Design an enzyme around this catalytic site. Structure first.
Site, mmCIF file in Angstrom:
data_model
loop_
_atom_site.group_PDB
_atom_site.id
_atom_site.type_symbol
_atom_site.label_atom_id
_atom_site.label_comp_id
_atom_site.label_asym_id
_atom_site.label_seq_id
_atom_site.Cartn_x
_atom_site.Cartn_y
_atom_site.Cartn_z
ATOM 1 N N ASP A 1 -7.970 -8.451 43.596
ATOM 2 C CA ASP A 1 -6.599 -8.347 42.635
ATOM 3 C C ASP A 1 -6.019 -6.913 42.571
ATOM 4 O O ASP A 1 -5.114 -6.733 43.068
ATOM 5 C CB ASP A 1 -5.716 -9.241 41.564
ATOM 6 C CG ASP A 1 -6.003 -10.697 41.946
ATOM 7 O OD1 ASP A 1 -5.859 -11.278 43.182
ATOM 8 O OD2 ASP A 1 -6.935 -12.096 41.391
ATOM 9 N N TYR B 1 -1.529 -17.168 40.721
ATOM 10 C CA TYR B 1 -2.476 -17.011 39.313
ATOM 11 C C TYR B 1 -1.726 -16.117 38.175
ATOM 12 O O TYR B 1 -0.728 -15.769 39.038
ATOM 13 C CB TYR B 1 -3.928 -16.657 39.718
#
Ligand SMILES: *[C@@H]1O[C@H](CO)[C@@H](O[C@@H]2O[C@H](CO)[C@@H](O[C@@H]3O[C@H](CO)[C@@H](O)[C@H](O)[C@@H]3O)[C@H](O)[C@H]2NC(C)=O)[C@H](O)[C@H]1NC(C)=O
Ligand SMILES: *[C@@H]1O[C@H](CO)[C@@H](O[C@@H]2O[C@H](CO)[C@@H](O[C@@H]3O[C@H](CO)[C@@H](O)[C@H](O)[C@@H]3O)[C@H](O)[C@H]2NC(C)=O)[C@H](O)[C@H]1NC(C)=O
Ligand code: NAG
Ligand code: NAG
Ligand code: NAG
Ligand code: NAG
Ligand code: NAG
Ligand code: NAG
Ligand code: NAG
Ligand code: NAG
Ligand code: CA
Ligand code: CA
Ligand code: CA
Ligand code: CA
Ligand code: CL
Ligand code: CL
Ligand code: CL
Ligand code: CL
Ligand code: CL
Ligand code: CL
Ligand code: CL
Ligand code: CL
Ligand code: CL
Ligand code: CL
Ligand code: CU
Ligand code: CU
Ligand code: MG
Ligand code: MG
Ligand code: MG
Ligand code: MG
Ligand code: MG
Ligand code: MG
Ligand code: MG
Ligand code: MG
Ligand code: MG
Ligand code: MG
Lengths: 737, 737
Positions: free
Chosen positions: A356, A436
């Protein structure tokens, strides 16, 4: 009468925030110097053969120079930038990290290759294992459209999926798969039905493909395979011809006409629960705000805590110089990386191992006032630079004082009751990275404890449910949908400096033991004992939390003790989510995420071991800029500056309770740093936020001592949150360039 | 303007609370009948040869009759009392449990021996292993004074300890030690310095003793040993003579002149932290209370949850008929037992293995308004009966709606942000049992999740620090004080009935596995899978939470599924404190606490397996009324009514952060019960406590949907808590008897 109002308090930081992001003017000076030194093309006009600038950020000071400044009247450390520039002008393309400084720009300023924090010793990242940047993303998208939007493939896709090409979106798995032995770079991909509500991840089609994207000349890129119902086709024509035969199996198609199950927000046709026509409770500050800050230095004080914050594009917020009652306990606390690693029967999810920080955790959206943080929160603006634009992000993080739902301590006895309230300082930011939503919280307590936590929400990356092969890898959670199984794992750099830098790491091991006591000769008792064991050396295996919780992990001062002879210490105490990766040997992350395999690691602090991952790691499968395992070289920790690299995680097997979205309440992980013999006693006792009730046996009278807190009824205004300050988007951009 | 006020709402319970404690009138009828049936002596005039009544409480209905009443229009179950009466009129004394009913008293009412829930098949508990009741406590106290207050022992005690007998308190270790092989009952003890602030546990003297208290004739009781500095003396005279020799070692004495380190409440000479002259934050209800209740039935409703509460002297609060959206998920949720088991070098702490239900968890003190619970809490009165008196306890438990510090879920994408708030219903009580304060919380969420938690605070039971022997068993935390090592373990009966009574227990096991996929022949991948495994039979070993969290534990409906074919289930999810006893084979609890050795146990529901411990267990070391292991007899669980017996615990090694008291923030244990395929989707989506923000790309306009919640500024009164309702003490007594 009205509650007594007080204004927000501002203070002056003890020192300058030497970790802070570059000012707009500093970014501009650096970009200008890059443009005068190299032939730089604007990103909007760039291709794989251009040079262009990606990133320009603060290169943070080294620790000894920082400490000399903070503690010993030292000079300000040099102000330097890290820049990452793509160079395509040569025979081969690469990204290079360059140091630009010192700043401001003067005749002393230079530009040099930058690699000290890369364990692989390189400033240059080869094109094949390069960042998935705007240029490469665009090339891949164009290539996929070139292959998937032919007359034949339009027919194949509509036939198998049930909607035309215009109604789906096809995209590539991350990371890419570069093979150093052959030089080839390949990648898998899939298609998902387009939605109006960002729910594409809930409608994966089960149509897959594989392509070769080797080299900088896209005319040589080639589709290798189409994969459907676990069968491999080596051309569009082969698949098309197979589809014409009577024996061809088409798997059940998504019902695109009935997607209400993907919608998050309330159906206003739904009945209201009893009393839900009353507003839920609100936290208020009857006497105003009880934390202070220096707005220019992003220095915060609360109830004897102090710290500075810093912001990066890669990771979001970091904390420096965390002090409690005038002593530093943590030099640096910084999230390092977050991974999401999927297991699946299918070649999209099985090849998904996100980094990420490669996408960026600190380049996302504002907080929603009143909802993401309480209405009493204060909000702070941060900034980043990417691809020719400076981004200013208001409402980037919030700070608030909570009243926890339980008191900090109490006791009743001997005709008194003594209770201490539990107000906490809280620092939050939320990073929504595609599907997310990650909610990060740092919670500080009156005694000197800090809790670090994460919660996850948002849309899951589900997979197509094939009854023949999908069951080992997920639950069937909708008609043709699997809840694909994945691990979330997060690494935190926790540079505790307990009673100075020179520390020892120890554990008190707990065990049952059979003993005989001198006061009962001959009688064997099964009892329990502790044994202190010193972690003398870096352990390649890391540390996993002990079975049945039978141990306490400490960072101790090497030399400083409390009054009873115990080393001053902090206990690293696991909460929920003390888990690491299940998978051991991933083709999608062989060497790129080697910190994620144990609960925690202890290392000797080094300026060259700045960070456990990089934004440049994810595609560099075998030779990443940082291979975390390089830090683990059996060095003595016995009276050394120690860093703990602490992991939080979740093994996520989505079920019905993840549709339409995962919930934050049950997707939680945390750890605490708590004093352990760090003082002579528990150090909340000086707060005024407590009561001492006494009862006199003879006079039958009660007395209440509230320590200057007047609980008499008083009036306040319950203020509207600053909703007007929330604008959608990933920051306001100013083009520089 | 003023926020819109609304009144507290009351409702009518669907059914009668058939679990509720006896009314005063019912207790009186039973006591009257006991007095007319037997020769009953008032407890204040009683000795070991009298008969007297200890306890009179509700004997709760059996489950099938309860369910027939709740669900199938059945008759009210019979209203019966359990009574415990000491009978000393015979040749040997014993306590006997007797059933008195049905009630109200009529010609149908009988008194019968009661034993069905005792695994040992007995209604009678022999004197030797009897309850440590008021009569036995008084006999022991008198015996100790008779031995310790002689001319010689007064001199010994002052010489060794440094203060006269009047300035200390000597007392006995629990449990007592009865040896069935010889018939002897012995007990150890120690002395602690008297304090004015209930801090005796922080000033243990290191003077120990051992006595034989066999039989009902105290004239035959004898002191066996005095123990000091790990030496055993068989008489006062021997110890006195040893003390006269030049070679006698007296260990360092407590500094009784400097005990400020034991004081909990603020030193008002202490400086105030910056801004601590402002009141900390308060939770308010701008539009009033959002949970409802039936005051007579102690039935509560909140956001589609419903349940009844019940109160017992042994355990405090229990919950029955817990429903969510109109379906029962849990028949009974009830704390069963709490143990505190010490390890030590010394014969007091090493012989301490408390059963807190023997002392009583439900016979303690009121909650302190504003501090123990938020000011928005509602408070409830409960009652008990002991030794001729009915006790009414106001402020016994509280109910409040919290706003948690994080949203329940959110997502940002596709030009919207959708966030749902996280209000929770909370039920708390606090049991202060001598030195310990236990804080119990039950927290209900909008989706159907419930969290059960405990936190501990109060004074530790420390030990005397002997440098020669104490180090394996605790840290030196004050000049002559060890933080004695102990386990806290708590058992909860969690009678989940998921989609009816007939259930299965399963686990999804997670593992890494090497596989080859059909779409890449010959290429081995290390991936991860799930495998569902059914717990077919009761396992004597219990269940321990899996290494690295690699499993999910479910209670599934045997027959009911959701729309995608998955069994409707609830996941029992561990939070912190998922630990069990370290010690395996304790002389102080051989068979009395056999549930405490694993994290959880699954059994077939039986009315005869009502409870995992009793108030009568602790001294009955080998033949307790309930031996939990009797429940574990390999019965099929494969489509049966299952009960989960779930443990929470703490391995407590006190340090400086436990002086003067332990803190609740880091002494925490919890588990959750969360829906898992129980619905087709996540079931909070119907709440109005959410926002839907949209941004229009073309018009550049934002819209906010608040679902009827008006966030406009409005005025409220921040009310003073009901402090006037808090009176110190363990309930108001009315003598009956
Ligand atoms: C912070 O600490 C780091 C790590 O100790 C320092 O890294 C060092 O940086 C210098 C360049 O400024 C490196 O020197 C260069 O080495 C190359 C390779 O041999 C050489 O060709 C160049 O001419 C130059 O000498 C040095 O290698 C590097 N040290 C390590 C161990 O990697 C850094 O300078 C410190 N930052 C500040 C602001 O002081
Ligand atoms: C709730 O369920 C329990 C357990 O099934 C029932 O326990 C039973 O209670 C009766 C007495 O009311 C017991 O009967 C007695 O047995 C003794 C010993 O043989 C005998 O001497 C007496 O004359 C009498 O028959 C019975 O043993 C006992 N069952 C078990 C398995 O322990 C209880 O009756 C139920 N409660 C209600 C309110 O229905
Ligand atoms: C800069 O590069 C571009 C191609 O990217 C080229 O057209 C141009 O000639 C270069 N500039 C100079 C001054 O050589
Ligand atoms: C795909 O092809 C169709 C016609 O075959 C064309 O109209 C459309 O513009 C193409 N889509 C893209 C994104 O190039
Ligand atoms: C809203 O509710 C209606 C009626 O229950 C239902 O048919 C529909 O699927 C729901 N729509 C959405 C967008 O959730
Ligand atoms: C960033 O935003 C803050 C707050 O709105 C503002 O004061 C600052 O000037 C902004 N920076 C720039 C250069 O836009
Ligand atoms: C009741 O017991 C007491 C002794 O505890 C005895 O004095 C008395 O005689 C007994 N009562 C009757 C009626 O026998
Ligand atoms: C202990 O003995 C002393 C005198 O030797 C006496 O004054 C005192 O009352 C006794 N204490 C108790 C509790 O019996
Ligand atoms: C209160 O503070 C004074 C001065 O610091 C100290 O000497 C004393 O020990 C404290 N007293 C108590 C009861 O804690
Ligand atoms: C118990 O207390 C409640 C609340 O004060 C009261 O209504 C009730 O009458 C009390 N019961 C008795 C019998 O004292
Ligand atoms: Ca350190
Ligand atoms: Ca090293
Ligand atoms: Ca059940
Ligand atoms: Ca059984
Ligand atoms: Cl290089
Ligand atoms: Cl579908
Ligand atoms: Cl603000
Ligand atoms: Cl040790
Ligand atoms: Cl590589
Ligand atoms: Cl019996
Ligand atoms: Cl002392
Ligand atoms: Cl109330
Ligand atoms: Cl399976
Ligand atoms: Cl026994
Ligand atoms: Cu997930
Ligand atoms: Cu404890
Ligand atoms: Mg700045
Ligand atoms: Mg100078
Ligand atoms: Mg300079
Ligand atoms: Mg300034
Ligand atoms: Mg160093
Ligand atoms: Mg009642
Ligand atoms: Mg009838
Ligand atoms: Mg009747
Ligand atoms: Mg009624
Ligand atoms: Mg049954």
């Amino acid at each position: 009468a009205e509650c007594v109002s007080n204004e927000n308090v501002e203070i002056e930081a003890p020192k300058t925030n030497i970790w802070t992001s570059l000012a707009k003017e500093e970014v501009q000076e650096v970009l200008d110097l890059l443009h005068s030194t190299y032939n730089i093309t604007e990103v909007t006009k760039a291709d794989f053969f251009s040079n262009y600038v990606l990133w320009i950020e603060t290169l943070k000071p080294n620790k000894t120079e920082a400490l000399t400044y903070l503690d010993e009247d030292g000079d300000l450390p040099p102000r330097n930038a890290r820049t990452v520039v793509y160079f395509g002008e040569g025979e081969e393309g690469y990204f290079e990290e360059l140091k630009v400084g010192p700043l401001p720009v003067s005749d002393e300023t230079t530009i040099e290759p930058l690699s000290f924090y890369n364990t692989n010793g390189k400033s240059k990242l080869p094109f094949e294992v390069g960042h998935l940047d705007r240029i490469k993303s665009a090339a891949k998208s164009s290539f996929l459209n070139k292959n998937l939007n032919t007359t034949i493939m339009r027919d194949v896709l509509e036939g198998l999926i049930g909607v035309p090409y215009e109604d789906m979106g096809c995209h590539s798995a991350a990371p890419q798969l570069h093979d150093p032995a052959t030089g080839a770079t390949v990648d898998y991909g899939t298609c998902n039905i387009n939605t109006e509500n960002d729910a594409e991840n809930l409608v994966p089609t089960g149509f897959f493909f594989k392509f070769d994207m080797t080299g900088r000349d896209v005319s040589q890129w080639k589709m290798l395979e189409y994969i459907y119902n676990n069968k491999v086709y080596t051309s569009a024509e082969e698949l098309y011809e197979a589809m014409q035969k009577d024996d061809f199996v088409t798997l059940p198609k998504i019902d695109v006409d009935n997607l209400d199950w993907t919608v998050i927000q309330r159906n206003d046709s739904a009945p209201v629960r009893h009393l839900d026509d009353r507003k839920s409770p609100r936290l208020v500050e009857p006497e105003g705000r009880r934390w202070a800050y220096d707005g220019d230095e992003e220095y915060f004080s609360w109830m004897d805590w102090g710290f500075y914050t810093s912001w990066s594009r890669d990771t979001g917020i970091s904390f420096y110089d965390i002090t409690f009652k005038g002593e530093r306990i943590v030099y640096e606390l910084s999230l390092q990386e977050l991974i999401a690693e999927y297991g699946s029967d299918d070649p999209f999810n099985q090849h998904t191992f996100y980094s990420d920080i490669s996408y960026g955790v600190g380049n996302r959206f504002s907080l929603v006032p009143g909802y993401d943080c309480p209405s009493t929160a204060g909000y702070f603006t941060t900034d980043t630079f990417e691809y020719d634009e400076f981004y200013n992000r208001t409402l980037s993080y919030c700070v608030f004082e909570n009243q926890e739902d339980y008191s900090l301590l109490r006791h009743t006895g001997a005709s008194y009751s003594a209770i201490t309230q539990n107000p906490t300082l809280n620092v939050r930011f939320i990073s929504t990275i595609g599907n997310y939503d990650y909610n990060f919280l740092y919670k500080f307590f009156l005694d000197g404890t800090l809790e670090v936590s994460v919660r996850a929400a948002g849309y899951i990356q589900a997979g197509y449910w094939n009854p023949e092969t999908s069951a080992p890898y997920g639950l069937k959670i909708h008609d043709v949908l699997s809840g694909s199984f994945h691990d979330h794992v997060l690494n935190y750099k926790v540079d505790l400096d307990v009673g100075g830098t020179k520390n020892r790491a120890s554990q008190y091991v707990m065990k049952d033991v059979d003993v005989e006591y001198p006061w009962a000769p001959g009688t064997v008792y099964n009892t329990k004992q502790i044994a202190r064991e010193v972690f003398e050396n870096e352990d390649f295996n890391g540390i996993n939390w002990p079975e049945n919780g039978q141990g306490i992990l400490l960072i101790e001062s090497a030399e400083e003790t409390n009054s009873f002879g115990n080393p001053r210490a902090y206990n690293i105490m696991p909460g929920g989510g003390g888990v690491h990766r299940i998978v051991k040997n991933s083709r999608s992350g062989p060497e790129t995420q080697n910190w994620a395999r144990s609960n925690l690691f202890l290392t000797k602090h080094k300026d060259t071991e700045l960070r456990s991952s990089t934004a440049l790691n994810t595609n560099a499968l075998y030779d990443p800029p940082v291979n975390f395992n390089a830090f683990l070289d059996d060095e003595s920790l016995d009276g050394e500056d120690i860093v703990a690299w602490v992991n939080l995680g979740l093994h996520h097997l989505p079920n019905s309770n993840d549709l339409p979205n995962t919930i934050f309440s049950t997707a939680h992980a945390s750890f605490m740093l708590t004093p352990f013999n760090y003082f002579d006693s528990e150090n909340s006792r000086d707060t005024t936020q407590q009561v001492f009730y006494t009862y006199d046996d003879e006079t039958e009278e009660s007395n209440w001592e509230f320590y200057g807190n007047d609980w008499s009824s008083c009036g306040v205004e319950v203020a509207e949150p600053n909703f007007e300050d929330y604008t959608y988007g990933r920051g306001t951009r100013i083009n520089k360039k």
